[PDB]
C-alpha cells in the first residue's frame, strides 16, 4: 500500500496543467489495464477513454498512438522509434493518449521496461536520442496477467477487466465504478436482439410468445439481464467477452435474416405459421454451438492446443436463409417426424437424433406445403444441381463451374458454408489442419466460384515462413486492403487474404491483430472494404518417443544436451514437434476449429487425379495407372503406419514421387541402354530380360521417395511388392533392381583404385 500510494501521489497531475489524465481515475497520468483471461475488455477501455477524452477535453483532436510489442525479448529501441515522431514541439504541450500493448508472446524484459519507462520516466538508446515522459500524455499499458510476495504490476494504478460472469457474480448491483466495467451502455446495437426474453419468459406457444411481429431499433431491457440471458444459451461455461460477442453477433445476423422475406403478411402462407419463430430461435441457438463454443481443450504445454471438437464429431445443422430472400437452406439435419406429434433432427447419414422437439407436425405440414428445400441429400445429387444449390445459398446467382476435379461431398459443402457464414457474420475464421488437408484447395475453389468469369485476383494466399517479421505481415495486409479496394471498385468482388501456416512465426500476435481487432499496426482497418482474412494453423503434435530416440541417435546428436536447448514451446523443445509451431494467442484459441480429417476415399480420389494428370505427357496404360495408384496408396499407408521412422504423411509426397517417376520414365531409354551395357560388362551371362519402362521407373522412384530413406526397408518391400504385376512381385527383385540402378549410376566416374564401393556410398 505504501508503494501504491507513493506512485499514485507522484503520478498525479496538477489541476491547472492541462493533461490527458482528466479521463483516468483522479488525474493519474499512468494506467495499467490488465486481466487474467483474454478478450474481456482491455481495449474497449482504451477506446472508451479516448471516446471520453474528445467530448470532455475541449480539444479539436487528441492524438492516439498504439504501440504493440511482439518480440519475446522486449525491444526498447522499437518503442523509442515509435515514440520519436511524437517528440516534436507540436505534441509537447497537447494531450496524447499513448496506448502500449504488451502481447502474450513477450516473456523477458517486461518489468525492466516498465520500471524504465513509467517510473524512471525515460528511454534512451546507444545513439543518444532520449525520450522523457511528460505529465500531460496518458501512458495506459494494457497487459495480460503473467500469472505464475507481489508481482511488479500491482504498484501501478490498475483497472481489472472481468469476464462476463464475474460481472454478474460480483457486481450483482450495477455500482458502475471506473475499476470494474460491466455491460457497456453503448453496447446495445447488436446485443439488443433480446428475443430470448420473449421465447423464454413466454414459454407457452398460444400466448403469442414470439408474436407475429418483432424487430429491432431500440432497447427494451437492463444491462444486467442481457448478460444473464446470454449466459444460459451460450453453451460455454465461463465465456470471455470475445466469446459472448461472437455468439450474440451470429444470433443477431440470423434473426435479422429471419425477419426478412417469408416473415411478412401473406394471405394463406401457412394461415398461422405457428412456431416458426420458435423454430428459428431454438434451432439456431442450437446451431450456434458450432460457431461460438471453443473447439480446443480448455505433453504438458500441448494440453490447451489439443482439438476436442474434431470435424468428424457431432454434426452441424447449418440453416441458412438464401440472401436473395426467397427460400431457406436445410443442409445438414434431415429432420424426421417423431411419433408423438413432434419432429426431431437426425444426422446426415447415421440417423441418430441430435436434438428433440425442434419443430411440430402442424408446421411440418405447413413447410412441406410451402415446398421448402427440406430433406434433400447432397450425397446423391447431380453436380449441376449441387452447384446451383450451394451457389444460391452462398448468394451469387451464377452457375458457371470454376472447376470439375474438385469433388463436392456433403462434408466438403458444409465446410465452405461454415467459412461463408463466418464471413457474413463477422467472426474471424481461423482453421487448424495438417499440411495438404484440403483447406487451401477449398479456399481456392471458393475464391474461383466467387470470381465466376472475371480475371481478378480475389485470392492472396501468403505462405508465412518461420522468419516472417511484423513488417512483412503489415505490408501484406495493407497491400491486400488496397487490392480489395481496387477489386470492389472495378469488378465488385470480395477479396480473400489467406495466411497459410499462421502459427509458425515468432510474431503471431500480428495475425491476431489483423483478424480479431481489425487493426493494422494501430491504424484501424478500413471498414466496408470487401477484404476477408483467413488464417490456417499447423496442429500441435509431438513426435513418438521412439522417433525422438531415433533422431537423437543419428550421427553425433545435438552438440550439447537436449534439455538445455533454448527453442521451447513451454517445456517441449521445438525439435520434438512435427510442425515447429509457436504458441497461439489466447484470444485466438476460442476461434480455432478443426478443418477435418482426410478420408481414405478422398485420398484415393486425389491419387487417381494425380496419376491421370500424367497420361497426357507419358501416355500411360490402364495397367500402369492401376499399378502406380495402388503402389503409391500402399506406400503412404505403410509410411503412416510406421510411427518410428515417419511422423506424418502428406498428399504432397505423391506429387513428388510421380515427378521422380516422370523423370525416370523420360530418361528410361538411355538409362536402360546404359544399364544393359553395364550388365554386359559384368561376368553375368545373357540373363537380362525385358524391362518395362513404366515398371522399371516406378520400381526405382519408390526406391528414392519412399524406400531409401527408411530403416525397415525389408518390411516396406514385402508390404509393397504384392501390388506389383505378377512377374515382378518379389522383395528380392525390388532390392536387386535398386542395387543394379545404384551400380549403374556409380559406374561412370573415375573413382580411385583404393576407394570402397559400399552400400552407403552408392546410396549417397
Ligand atoms: N462491456 C464490455 N466490455 C468489454 N468488451 C465488450 C463489452 N461488451 C461487448 N464487448 C466486446 O468484447 C470485445 C472484447 O474485445 P477487446 O478488444 O476488448 O478484447 P481485449 O481486451 O483487447 O483482449 P485482447 O487484448 O486479449 O485481445 C470487444 O471487441 C467488444 O466489442
Ligand atoms: Mg487489445
TrEMBL record:
<feature type="binding site">
    <location>
        <position position="101"/>
    </location>
    <ligand>
        <name>Mg(2+)</name>
    </ligand>
</feature>
<feature type="binding site">
    <location>
        <position position="39"/>
    </location>
    <ligand>
        <name>ATP</name>
    </ligand>
</feature>
<comment type="subunit">
    <text>Monomer. Interacts with UBE2L3/UBCH7; UBE2L3/UBCH7 is the most efficient ubiquitin-conjugating enzyme E2 for the ubiquitin ligase activity. Interacts with UBE2N/UBC13; promoting 'Lys-63'-linked ubiquitination of target proteins.</text>
</comment>
<feature type="binding site">
    <location>
        <position position="142"/>
    </location>
    <ligand>
        <name>Mg(2+)</name>
    </ligand>
</feature>
<protein>
    <recommendedName>
        <fullName>E3 ubiquitin-protein ligase RNF213</fullName>
    </recommendedName>
</protein>
<feature type="binding site">
    <location>
        <position position="182"/>
    </location>
    <ligand>
        <name>ATP</name>
    </ligand>
</feature>
<feature type="binding site">
    <location>
        <position position="187"/>
    </location>
    <ligand>
        <name>ATP</name>
    </ligand>
</feature>
<feature type="binding site">
    <location>
        <position position="184"/>
    </location>
    <ligand>
        <name>ATP</name>
    </ligand>
</feature>
<feature type="binding site">
    <location>
        <position position="42"/>
    </location>
    <ligand>
        <name>ATP</name>
    </ligand>
</feature>
<feature type="binding site">
    <location>
        <position position="43"/>
    </location>
    <ligand>
        <name>ATP</name>
    </ligand>
</feature>
<feature type="binding site">
    <location>
        <position position="517"/>
    </location>
    <ligand>
        <name>Mg(2+)</name>
    </ligand>
</feature>
<comment type="similarity">
    <text>Belongs to the AAA ATPase family.</text>
</comment>
<feature type="binding site">
    <location>
        <position position="41"/>
    </location>
    <ligand>
        <name>ATP</name>
    </ligand>
</feature>
Amino acid at each position: 500500500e505504501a508503494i501504491q500510494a507513493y506512485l499514485a501521489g507522484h503520478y498525479r497531475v496538477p489541476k491547472q496543467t492541462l493533461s490527458a489524465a482528466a479521463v483516468f481515475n483522479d488525474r493519474l497520468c499512468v494506467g495499467i489495464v490488465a486481466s487474467e483471461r483474454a478478450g474481456v475488455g482491455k481495449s474497449l477501455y482504451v477506446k472508451r477513454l479516448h471516446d471520453k477524452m474528445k467530448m470532455q477535453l475541449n480539444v479539436k483532436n487528441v492524438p492516439l498512438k498504439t504501440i504493440r510489442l511482439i518480440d519475446p525479448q522486449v525491444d526498447e529501441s522499437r518503442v523509442l522509434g515509435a515514440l520519436l515522431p511524437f517528440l516534436d514541439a507540436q505534441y509537447q504541450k497537447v494531450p496524447v493518449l499513448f496506448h502500449l500493448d504488451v502481447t502474450s508472446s513477450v516473456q523477458t524484459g517486461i518489468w525492466v521496461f516498465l520500471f524504465k519507462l513509467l517510473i524512471l520516466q525515460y528511454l534512451m538508446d546507444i545513439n543518444g536520442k532520449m525520450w522523457l515522459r511528460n505529465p500531460c500524455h496518458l501512458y495506459i499499458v494494457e497487459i495480460l496477467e503473467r500469472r505464475t510476495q507481489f508481482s511488479f504490476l500491482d504498484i501501478f494504478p490498475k483497472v481489472t477487466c472481468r469476464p462476463p460472469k464475474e460481472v454478474i457474480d460480483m457486481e450483482l448491483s450495477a455500482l458502475r465504478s471506473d475499476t470494474e466495467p460491466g455491460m457497456d451502455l453503448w453496447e446495445f446495437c447488436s446485443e439488443t436482439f433480446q428475443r430470448p426474453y420473449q421465447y423464454l419468459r413466454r414459454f407457452n406457444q398460444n400466448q403469442d410468445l414470439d408474436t407475429f411481429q418483432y424487430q429491432e431499433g431500440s432497447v427494451e431491457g437492463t444491462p444486467e439481464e442481457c448478460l444473464q440471458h446470454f449466459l444460459f444459451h451460450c453453451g460455454v461455461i465461463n465465456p470471455s467477452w470475445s466469446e459472448l460477442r461472437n455468439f450474440a453477433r451470429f444470433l443477431n445476423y440470423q434473426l435479422r435474416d429471419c425477419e426478412a422475406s417469408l416473415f411478412c403478411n401473406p394471405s394463406f402462407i401457412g394461415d398461422t405459421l405457428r412456431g416458426f419463430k420458435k423454430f428459428v430461435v431454438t434451432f439456431m441457438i442450437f446451431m450456434a454451438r458450432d460457431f461460438a463454443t471453443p473447439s480446443l481443450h480448455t505433453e504438458e504445454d500441448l494440453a490447451p492446443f489439443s482439438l476436442r471438437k474434431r470435424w468428424e464429431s457431432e454434426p452441424h445443422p447449418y440453416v441458412f436463409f438464401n440472401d436473395d430472400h426467397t427460400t431457406m437452406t436445410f443442409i445438414g439435419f434431415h429432420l424426421q417426424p417423431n411419433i408423438n406429434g413432434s419432429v426431431d433432427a437426425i444426422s446426415h447419414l447415421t440417423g441418430k437424433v441430435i436434438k428433440r422437439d425442434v419443430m411440430t407436425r402442424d408446421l411440418y405440414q405447413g413447410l412441406l406445403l410451402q415446398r421448402v428445400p427440406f430433406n434433400v441429400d447432397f450425397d446423391k445429387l447431380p453436380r449441376h444441381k449441387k452447384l446451383e444449390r450451394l451457389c444460391l445459398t452462398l448468394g451469387i446467382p451464377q452457375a458457371t463451374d470454376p472447376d470439375k476435379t474438385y469433388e463436392l461431398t456433403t462434408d466438403n459443402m458444409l465446410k465452405i458454408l461454415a467459412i461463408e457464414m463466418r464471413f457474413r457474420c463477422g467472426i474471424p475464421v481461423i482453421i487448424m489442419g495438417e499440411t495438404g488437408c484440403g483447406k487451401t484447395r477449398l479456399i481456392k475453389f471458393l475464391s474461383d466460384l466467387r470470381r465466376g468469369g472475371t480475371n481478378a485476383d480475389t485470392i492472396k494466399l501468403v505462405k508465412v515462413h518461420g522468419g516472417t517479421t511484423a513488417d512483412m505481415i503489415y505490408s501484406r495486409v495493407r497491400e491486400a486492403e488496397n487490392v480489395a479496394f481496387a477489386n470492389k471498385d472495378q469488378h465488385q468482388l470480395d477479396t480473400i487474404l489467406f495466411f497459410d501456416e499462421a502459427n509458425t512465426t515468432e510474431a503471431i500476435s500480428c495475425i491476431k491483430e489483423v483478424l480479431c481487432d481489425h487493426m493494422v499496426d494501430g491504424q484501424p482497418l478500413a471498414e466496408d472494404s470487401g477484404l476477408h482474412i483467413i488464417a490456417a494453423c499447423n496442429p500441435y503434435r509431438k513426435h513418438s518417443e521412439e522417433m525422438i530416440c531415433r533422431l537423437e541417435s543419428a550421427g553425433l546428436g545435438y552438440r550439447v544436451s537436449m534439455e538445455e536447448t533454448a527453442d521451447r514451446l513451454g517445456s517441449i523443445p521445438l525439435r520434438q514437434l512435427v510442425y515447429r509451431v509457436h504458441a497461439l494467442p489466447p484470444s485466438l484459441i476460442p476461434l480455432v476449429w478443426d478443418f477435418g480429417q482426410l478420408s481414405d476415399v478422398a485420398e484415393k480420389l486425389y491419387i487417381q487425379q494425380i496419376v491421370q494428370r500424367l497420361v497426357e505427357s507419358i501416355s500411360l496404360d490402364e495397367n500402369g495407372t492401376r499399378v502406380i495408384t495402388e503402389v503409391l496408396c500402399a506406400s503412404q499407408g505403410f509410411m503412416r503406419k510406421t510411427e518410428d521412422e515417419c511422423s506424418f504423411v502428406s498428399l504432397r509426397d505423391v506429387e513428388r514421387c510421380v515427378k521422380v517417376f516422370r523423370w525416370f520414365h523420360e530418361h528410361s531409354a538411355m538409362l536402360l541402354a546404359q544399364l544393359n551395357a553395364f550388365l554386359s560388362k559384368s561376368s553375368v551371362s545373357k540373363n537380362h530380360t525385358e524391362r518395362d519402362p513404366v515398371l522399371w521407373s516406378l520400381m526405382l522412384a519408390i526406391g528414392v521417395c519412399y524406400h531409401a530413406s527408411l530403416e525397415k526397408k525389408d518390411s516396406y518391400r514385402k508390404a509393397i511388392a504384392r501390388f506389383f504385376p505378377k512377374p515382378y512381385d518379389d522383395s528380392r527383385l525390388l532390392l536387386d533392381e535398386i542395387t543394379r540402378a545404384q551400380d549403374l549410376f556409380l559406374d561412370g566416374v573415375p573413382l580411385r583404385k583404393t576407394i570402397a564401393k559400399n552400400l552407403a556410398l552408392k546410396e549417397n
